[PDB]
Amino acid sequence: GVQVETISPGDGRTFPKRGQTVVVHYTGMLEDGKKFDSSRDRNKPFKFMLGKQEVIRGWEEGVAQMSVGQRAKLTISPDYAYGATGHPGIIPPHATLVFDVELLKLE
Numbered sequence: 106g107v108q109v110e111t112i113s114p115g116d117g118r119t120f121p122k123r124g125q126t127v128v129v130h131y132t133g134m135l136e137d138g139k140k141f142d143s144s145r146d147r148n149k150p151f152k153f154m155l156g157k158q159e160v161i162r163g164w165e166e167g168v169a170q171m172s173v174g175q176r177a178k179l180t181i182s183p184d185y186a187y188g189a190t191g192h193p194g195i196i197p198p199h200a201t202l203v204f205d206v207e208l209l210k211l212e
C-alpha cells in the first residue's frame with residue numbers, strides 16, 4: 106500500500122476532496138534513494154484531479170491524507186505504483202517508490 110509520514114504539518118483542516126484539482130511539488134525516488142523525477146526541476150507545480158486516476162493508486166490514496174501546506178513522505182509498494190512491469194525508461198520492475206510531496210493548494 107502507501108505509508109504517509111509527515112515531514113512538516115499542514116493546516117490540519119483542509120484535505121483534498123474527490124474531484125478537486127490537487128496542486129503539489131514532488132520529488133520521486135527509488136527505494137535506494139536515486140531520484141527519477143521532480144516537479145521542482147520543471148519549475149512548475151504538478152496538478153492532478155483526485156479520483157480521476159491520472160496518477161498511481163498510492164498517490165490517490167496517499168495525497169488524500171494530507172492537509173493543505175503539509176509536506177509528507179509517501180512510501181508506495183509496487184502494486185500501488187507500477188507493479189511487476191515497472192514503467193519503460195523510468196521505473197524498474199518491482200520498485201517501491203518514495204515521494205516527497207508538498208501540498209501547495211486545492212482548486
Ligand SMILES: C=C[C@H]1CN(Cc2ccccn2)C(=O)[C@@H]2CCC[C@H]1N2[S@](=N)(=O)c1cc(Cl)cc(Cl)c1
Binds near residue numbers: 141151161164196
Ligand atoms: C509526471 C506525472 C506523474 C506521472 N504519473 C502518472 C503517469 C502518467 C503517464 C505515464 C506514467 N505515469 C504518476 O502517477 C506519478 C505520480 C505523479 C507524479 C508523476 N508520476 S512519477 N512516478 O513521478 C513518474 C514521472 C515520470 Cl517523468 C514518468 C513516470 Cl513513468 C512516472
